[PDB]
Amino acid sequence: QVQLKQSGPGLVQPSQSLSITCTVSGFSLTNYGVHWVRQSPGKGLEWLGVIWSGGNTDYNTPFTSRLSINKDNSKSQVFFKMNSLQSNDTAIYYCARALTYYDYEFAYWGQGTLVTVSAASTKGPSVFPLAPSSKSTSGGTAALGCLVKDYFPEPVTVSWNSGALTSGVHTFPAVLQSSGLYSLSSVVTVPSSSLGTQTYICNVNHKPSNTKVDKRVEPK
Amino acid sequence: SQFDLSTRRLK
Amino acid sequence: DILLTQSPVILSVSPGERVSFSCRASQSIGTNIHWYQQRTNGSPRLLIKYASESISGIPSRFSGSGSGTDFTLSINSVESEDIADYYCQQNNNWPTTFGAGTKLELKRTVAAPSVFIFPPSDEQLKSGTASVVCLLNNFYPREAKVQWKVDNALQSGNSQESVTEQDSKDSTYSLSSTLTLSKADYEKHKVYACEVTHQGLSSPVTKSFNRG
């Protein structure tokens, strides 16, 4: 199977440089070019450039002087680097591959890397339980969750029972508090009859700060 | 059309 | 650079209906246009290439047509998992450019929210902050009112709301309202009430608790 897997999301200080690694499998960088695209709130989807099978590069015009793309064929890695970032370079950066070696129809994309350009510091979240009670139980269905509070920057991933619990899960979009830190909740609805038998754990991972917390959520 | 970085969806 | 204009910004349809997206180009680009789907938290997915040519693994309900400057992506019978944003891309002229996208929303029958309230955890209280969470689960449509009251006093400006994107399986929304106060303020009051108003309720629903 063809895959592009990118390095993790993170903070970059203004005026500083961005580095992303794209590791591919299921094809060889000697046969295919690898493209870079970003998606920002202001400018939407925006093609940045490409490194070709033979090592040649093209950069979209506004980035020619602050962009370098490199690779190591043997390691199946493509390296993206952009200089002197300002806050409006905050975006999701993707690496991508076309259907044919010479083309631009992007059939394979990396998972994207959220890059935030801010002067602030990275802070991991506190994780608190949202305990099921009778004030959260209707008709045999109980609601429960985790409050994921005071982190920066986006994103944070949340799963339940190590991925084994997916149905009934809602992970809310983060909101920015006045403190300049993000907060979200993640909830799930379950049978109330299972609260005595099953354990419920939110698996929280804030990659920019390397903060991993597993929070057990119990009725009070 | 404003793209949201959190959800990857238009607002 | 070629400018691509997608219209309208938002489409709203019912399941089973046919729907069309428009992509118009600032000058002729032949049939050199590709279409993409973006679902919640996802990367783009390639739907159609060169205006009309099919892509492997893509449902037959997706087709496209057009040439010159006026292009159309169609879905002949919309399903719930088609909730997404849709983008066009031209590559007749360097550099390749994308349109700004069209959002596809799905209509469904009215569904009242299920409401739950969560007092702050003793864990959170230890840090000197109190978050009171009120959850509105699986409802349609998106419009809803949350009114917070502490000891019959209307709270204002001290809560934040977050609404999920439309659920790809049942087309509902979920909403979280979070009331945030200092531990000191929290300890000084007894009754915490979350009141919910929605088109699907024949009456406002209140969920509340007394501290301790």
Numbering used by the authors:
A (entry chain B): 1 to 220
B (entry chain E): 1 to 11
C (entry chain A): 1 to 212
What does the paper say about this structure?
Recently, a unique binding site for a cyclic 12-residue peptide was discovered within a cavity formed by the light and heavy chains of the cetuximab Fab domain. Here, multiple crystal structures of meditope peptides incorporating different cyclization strategies bound to the central cavity of the cetuximab Fab domain are presented. Collectively, the structural and kinetic data presented here indicate that small perturbations introduced by different cyclization strategies can significantly affect the affinity of the meditope–Fab complex.
Based on these observations, we asked whether cyclization is necessary. Conversely, replacing the terminal cysteines with serines and thus creating a linear peptide reduced the affinity over 50-fold, with much of this difference being reflected in a decrease in the on-rate. In fact, there are two copies of the peptide–Fab complex in the asymmetric unit of this crystal (and all of the structures reported here) and each complex was refined independently of the other (e.g. no NCS averaging). As such, we also observe different conformations for the termini of the linear peptide bound to each Fab. In the other peptide–Fab complex the electron density is very weak, precluding the building of Ser12 into the model. Moreover, the hydroxyl group of Ser1 in the second complex makes a hydrogen bond to the backbone carbonyl of Ala100 LC (dOH⋯O=C = 3.0 Å). However, as noted, the B factors are high, suggesting that the interactions are weak. The remaining residues of the linear peptide, specifically 2–11, are nearly superimposable in both complexes (r.s.m.d. = 0.14–0.15 Å) and superimpose well on the original meditope peptides (r.s.m.d. = 0.44–0.77 Å). Of note, the SPR experiments were conducted at a neutral pH, where electrostatic repulsive forces between the two charged, deprotonated carboxylate residues (Ser12⋯Glu105) may be stronger than in the crystal (grown at pH ∼5.5). Weaker binding of the linear peptide is likely to reflect an entropic penalty.
